[PDB]
Amino acid sequence: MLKYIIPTIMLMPLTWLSKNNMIWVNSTAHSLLISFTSLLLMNQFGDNSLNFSLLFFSDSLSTPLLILTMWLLPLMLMASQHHLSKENLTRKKLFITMLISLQLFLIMTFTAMELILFYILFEATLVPTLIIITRWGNQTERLNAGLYFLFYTLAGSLPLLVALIYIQNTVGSLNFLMLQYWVQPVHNSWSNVFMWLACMMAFMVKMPLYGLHLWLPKAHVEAPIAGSMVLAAVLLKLGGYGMLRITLILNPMTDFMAYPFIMLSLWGMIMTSSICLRQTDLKSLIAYSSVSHMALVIVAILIQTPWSYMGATALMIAHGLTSSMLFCLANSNYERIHSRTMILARGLQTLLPLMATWWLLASLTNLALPPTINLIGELFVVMSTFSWSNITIILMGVNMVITALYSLYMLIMTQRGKYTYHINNISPSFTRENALMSLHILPLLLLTLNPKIILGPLY
Amino acid sequence: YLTHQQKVLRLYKRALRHLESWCIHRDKYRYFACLLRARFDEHKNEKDMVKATQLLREAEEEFWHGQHPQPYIFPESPGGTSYERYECYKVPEWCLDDWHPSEKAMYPDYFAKREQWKKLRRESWEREVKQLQEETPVGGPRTEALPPARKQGDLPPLWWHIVTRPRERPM
Amino acid sequence: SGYTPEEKLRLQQLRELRRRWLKDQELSPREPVLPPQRVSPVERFWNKFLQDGALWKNVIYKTYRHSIFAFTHVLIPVWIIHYYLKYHVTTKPYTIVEKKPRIFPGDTILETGEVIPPMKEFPDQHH
Amino acid sequence: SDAPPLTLEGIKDRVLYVLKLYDKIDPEKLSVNSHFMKDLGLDSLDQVEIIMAMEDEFGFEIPDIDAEKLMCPQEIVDYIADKKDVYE
């Protein structure tokens, strides 16, 4: 994949050596060209995947994320230069450099043919992510969130790190393809229980699974517009991709192990969904959208049926496009009313005619408006889940019903009503905003023309 | 609280419509409105305050068992169809300054006349507050009254927002 | 209690400008001054061609609207649909299905040339 | 709503006729400055009937307080036009 790796790398020299006032000019154009080249990976085959070298490999499960992944990067640069303008060149380039690195740390993450390699590259991502939030976060009020990251590594990565290394000695190697022929049954024994958790626990923090989700809502309070979009667009999907990946060597032990997760996952949806209503914060509810959505993916993986994995592939792609759009949509107010308060501003339709359109257009996909990909996946989950147990239908039935509530609550609470009288700075929608948003819905809808690509290797 | 006197008037004002709702027909309602009028006339001369307290209490429970489930409502009031039905068509007066010059130049009469609102908004700004400073109770206003201007050709204090509000039917 | 002396004059103080605040909304006749915009030659002919009026002249304008849309939006898609079915959908097996025609007594076939038997001898009821 | 516009002067004659339809209001005692309590001798009970008649004469409901302070036709004229945005 060197063809994709290096062009991103040289963008770092591009930032430093480009015309000081053209840093935004070159970056988008140069980065965008890479996005067009991203398509070439889609040369998929029916049976065998696309394997280049001993390190990098791509397939249907990872292909759409790669194409999706790069797509985000130019948008993050777009959304930021308004408030990065306040920053100076000496410290401004520091913002782009980190983002460029995270692209390298991501594309290689989804193409790592060796799990440790996957783990390594995956681990480093927190450094670009954290430094993006911490140093250049609008809030620096000592939220003390170090506990969560301290907890995460203690219960997550570190046991996972040991877990991986234990496998390599036993089986012989950790190449993902190699396990496809040497994986062995994992009988029910006390030791394997602990291996199973470590092999799964780390991702659950990042999906995030129910009970571990306390950290995500607070992030978007601190993280600026740039950091937020990638967090749910990309970083959350890491866990799903790994879980879909590592689960090749957890049979048949995963069966009984799954239930404790599934109940959290299945029940968590309604709890997480309804909590959306009481979220007074724009970014929190937007964050909560992911919490309930991903829970579907987790269950699809645990039931581990051929049909289910298709839904997660479609669902994983589907949600990321939406929420990433939503952050900017809600953030678009933060750059005007200088806060995340949902209730403070209302009736944006009259003062921003088009903007209410995007809220309408994006909200539908959240509530699974057919035939959008969102329903294609979400519906596929219902089909696969129902076979697992018919009783599961009710939780899906209520959750979807709940989904429409917040799907339209903000669209109502903000796009309608009297304009707040004391508010007098509501400026016309900017070209940057108009174009930037359009980049999201278009491909999200256009994927409906050819959803086949995002059906995972199962299809 | 509204004091004792106001409550009867507010109740008497509200009482008729529900009666009219049940009777409906003008002549029929007019008949029993006079019979209803024949009530509050009897207790018009009541003086003893506690005596007046008990009588009005009955008009609450008594009214509570006469109220129509679907009384007639003027559409442009709460409970009416035309409430919050044209708010969006009203527009802030402060959005003009963001207008592109193409839009602005189309209305030379308007803006030149607007400048006599902003100018009238700022030139009268300093004086009006000083009018309120000495006209404001010490330590915080006791009541929410707004005193008028007290000179020749003086704008009322805090006038801009009320005057500059939209029109009921803008288009 | 009627409007107090402060209330009585104050409303007029504001009502003077509230009403005048409606007077600024008065619009110049030239408005809304907007660019002429291009007029494609398709419009140009019919701007003057239809100003005379009357029944006869503007029906062809009505028929033009009906005729132009007919070819573009009726005759074109129907042509298009024909080719799609006639050479791409039918060519696949079990693509376009049709409930088979009903068969009644004494009907002759064309592919086979065979004729169905009539019905039995009715009892000749009072009918 | 087609185009039934209204004018400040027009509301005045409407007010009088509503005040003419009041039996107690003598035609010769009916005038713009005729204070209900004093010039017309109309008390709160009488005034509410007029306001109720006015509410049916303009298709807009007057709140509780806005019917109390109207003890003369001029206040009503100063009141109706302000409500209905009538400028000319």
Binding site: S427, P428 | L96, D98, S102, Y107, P166, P170 | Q25 | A3
Partner: peptide, 17 residues
């Protein structure tokens, strides 16, 4: 519309952009 003049002003955000 139904009368000479009486053309009411239009207030909106700057749509030129």
């Amino acid at each position: 519309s139904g009368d000479h003049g009486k053309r009411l002003f239009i207030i909106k955000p700057s749509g030129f952009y």
